Amino acid sequence: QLAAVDIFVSTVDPLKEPPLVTANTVLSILAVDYPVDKVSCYVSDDGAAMLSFESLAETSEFARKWVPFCKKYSIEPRAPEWYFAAKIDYLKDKVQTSFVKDRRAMKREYEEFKIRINALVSKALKCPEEGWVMQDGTPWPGNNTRDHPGMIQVFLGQNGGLDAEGNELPRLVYVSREKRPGFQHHKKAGAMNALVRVSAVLTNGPFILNLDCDHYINNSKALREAMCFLMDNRNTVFFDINLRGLDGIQGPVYVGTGCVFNRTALYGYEPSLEKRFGQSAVFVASTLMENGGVPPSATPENLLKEAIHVISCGYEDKSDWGMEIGWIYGSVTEDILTGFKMHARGWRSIYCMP
Numbered sequence: 633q634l635a636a637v638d639i640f641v642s643t644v645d646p647l648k649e650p651p652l653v654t655a656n657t658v659l660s661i662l663a664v665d666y667p668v669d670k671v672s673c674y675v676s677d678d679g680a681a682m683l684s685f686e687s688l689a690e691t692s693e694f695a696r697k698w699v700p701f702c703k704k705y706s707i708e709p710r711a712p713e714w715y716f717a718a719k720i721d722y723l724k725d726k727v728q729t730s731f732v733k734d735r736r737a738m739k740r741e742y743e744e745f746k747i748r749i750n751a752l753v754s755k756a757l758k759c760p761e762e763g764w765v766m767q768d769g770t771p772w773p774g775n776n777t778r779d780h781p782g783m784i785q786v787f788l789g790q791n792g793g794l795d796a797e798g799n800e801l802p803r804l805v806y807v808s809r810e811k812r813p814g815f816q817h818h819k820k821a822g823a824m825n826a827l828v829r830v831s832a833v834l835t836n837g838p839f840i841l842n843l844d845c846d847h848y849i850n851n852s853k854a855l856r857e858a859m860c861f862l863m864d865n866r867n868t869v870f871f872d873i874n875l876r877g878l879d880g881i882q883g884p885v886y887v888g889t890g891c892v893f894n895r896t897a898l899y900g901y902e903p904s905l906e907k908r909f910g911q912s913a914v915f916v917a918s919t920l921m922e923n924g925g926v927p928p929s930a931t932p933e934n935l936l937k938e939a940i941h942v943i944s945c946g947y948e949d950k951s952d953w954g955m956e957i958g959w960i961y962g963s964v965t966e967d968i969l970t971g972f973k974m975h976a977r978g979w980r981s982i983y984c985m986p
């Protein structure tokens with residue numbers, strides 16, 4: 633069977649992380665050969681850059697065309713830039729097939745997509761003074777980069793409008809955690825932790841996968857192959873049920889990038905209310921769930937509220953986050969801010985892609 637997966641991408645600066653490359657990674661994620669309902673893509677933008685937000689909006693709109701195309705004709709890789717670079721043998725066909733016209737159409741619409749991304753970049757290339765204004769008319773909450781409220785925006789998924797074939801697409805969530813003067817944010821680490829919490833509130837998939845913003849998925853089946861190991865040259869795998877003391881794997885394991893791993897390993901918990909996890913009833917509830925998921929009773933809105941709450945600024949204060957929970961904040965000794973901490977304690981599984 634196929635378990636839900638939450639996929640994290642972290643970006644920080646559109647000027648060293650070109651929006652188009654991020655777009656291609658995201659498009660490779662949204663087109664993944666896996667049940668649409670059970671794959672979700674969270675994109676932390678630590679820079680709160682409207683260029684990124686809009687590029688992401690654009691990306692989702694293009695995904696509406698690109699994803700059904702890929703699934704219909706079994707395309708790989710499912711990141712457009714690298715797909716259209718693979719040379720094709722047109723000579724082998726006597727006449728234009730339906731595939732190649734679908735595809736010439738598609739490439740054209742992708743080149744148009746690129747053009748509007750370039751437009752966004754260039755438009756951004758010199759600061760307006762009164763700050764950026766949304767296509768709405770309301771001011772952009774991210775303009776003050778070290779001083780701005782939490783932002784979450786969900787694209788696609790169940791109420792983000794179908795693809796070109798009337799089918800739904802995976803959730804695509806924009807997240808920019810609160811930044812305030814006087815609070816540390818611990819960089820990518822504090823970002824991964826906040827994404828753990830947000831994803832827990834919105835979807836709560838039993839597995840997590842963290843990809844760099846330039847790591848596009850090579851093979852649309854990557855998640856299925858991973859599940860072929862996670863539930864009963866070569867790549868990195870790890871499985872452990874650790875009862876026990878002295879036998880087997882001792883202590884924590886640290887997982888970085890490109891690896892599907894089980895969520896609950898993050899959480900401590902030997903087989904109490906205690907806010908070790910910070911104060912959010914919804915979140916700890918989520919940590920106490922068998923096979924992940926949210927209570928369907930909750931409505932998209934008020935859980936959007938608690939999702940904004942778990943990325944507030946000082947949520948982690950007086951909590952184990954960054955200390956013994958999640959991605960671990962460094963410069964003391966641990967030699968981390970390099971991975972998610974998987975506690976020995978209980979069930980642990982990792983499948984990494986090549």
Ligand SMILES: [Mn+2]
Pocket residue numbers: 816817818948949
């Ligand atoms: Mn802190």
